[PDB]
């Protein structure tokens, strides 16, 4: 086979995406959080484990990765702000070791 769409409402995708982002959020040396503002395409393929290819518009928030107010903060600042970034993440899920691995991310 060959990679075929996963509907947003899928729970593997929802785990994969949330994994891409938290790892994106550490890897960046800014002080605020980033969010997904849209998934542009979400695909999967089964090569032994399940390998997702996500394309995501990410935006910046005014919500510091410090503050306890964080997740409440994030739902809130909602439609306003900084800069839109678009990324492609490929996540790979190896369900007999129980593990989820981030194989590439490409941002613009």
UniProtKB/Swiss-Prot annotation:
* Disulphide bonds in the chain: 63-73, 87-107
Q: What Gene Ontology terms describe what this protein does at the molecular function level?
A: cysteine-type endopeptidase inhibitor activity
Q: Which GO terms describe its cellular component?
A: cytoplasm; extracellular space; vesicle
Instruction: Write down which residues bear the modification named Phosphoserine.
Output: 72
Q: Which UniProt keywords apply?
A: Disulfide bond, Phosphoprotein, Protease inhibitor, Secreted, Signal, Thiol protease inhibitor
Task: Name the site position(s) for Reactive site.
Answer: 1
Q: Locate the motif Secondary area of contact.
A: 45-49
| Localization annotation | Secreted
Q: What is its main location?
A: secreted
- Family that this chain belongs to: Belongs to the cystatin family.
Function, as annotated, reads: This protein binds tightly to and inhibits a variety of thiol proteases including ficin, papain, and cathepsins B, C, H, and L. Although isolated from egg white, it is also present in serum.
Q: What is this protein called?
A: Cystatin
Native species: Gallus gallus (Chicken)
Q: Which residues of the full protein are shown?
A: 32 to 139 of 139
């Amino acid at each position: 086979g060959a990679p075929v769409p996963v509907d947003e409402n899928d729970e593997g995708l929802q785990r994969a995406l949330q994994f891409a982002m938290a790892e994106y959020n550490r890897a960046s040396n800014d002080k605020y959080s980033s969010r997904v503002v849209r998934v542009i395409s979400a695909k999967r393929q089964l090569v032994s484990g399940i390998k997702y290819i996500l394309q995501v518009e990410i935006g910046r928030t005014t919500c510091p990765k410090s503050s306890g107010d964080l997740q409440s903060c994030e739902f809130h600042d909602e439609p306003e702000m900084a800069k839109y970034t678009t990324c492609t993440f490929v996540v790979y899920s190896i369900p007999w070791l129980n593990q989820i691995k981030l194989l590439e991310s490409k941002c613009q």
